[PDB]
Each structure stands twice: as structure tokens, then as C-alpha cells.
Amino acid sequence: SCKKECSGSRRTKKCMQKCNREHGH
Numbered sequence: 001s002c003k004k005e006c007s008g009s010r011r012t013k014k015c016m017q018k019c020n021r022e023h024g025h
Helices: 013-022
Strands: none
């Protein structure tokens, strides 16, 4: 709901890192 909802063709480290930090609660 944050990784696949952003991942494009070869980009994901951006949305992934964002979700990884947010889920760092």
C-alpha cells in the first residue's frame, strides 16, 4: 500500500525507503 502503489519500472528505492522509515514507528 506504499511500495507497489509507487513502484514504476525500475524505481522503488524512493517509495520503499519512505515506507520503510514511516513503518519504523
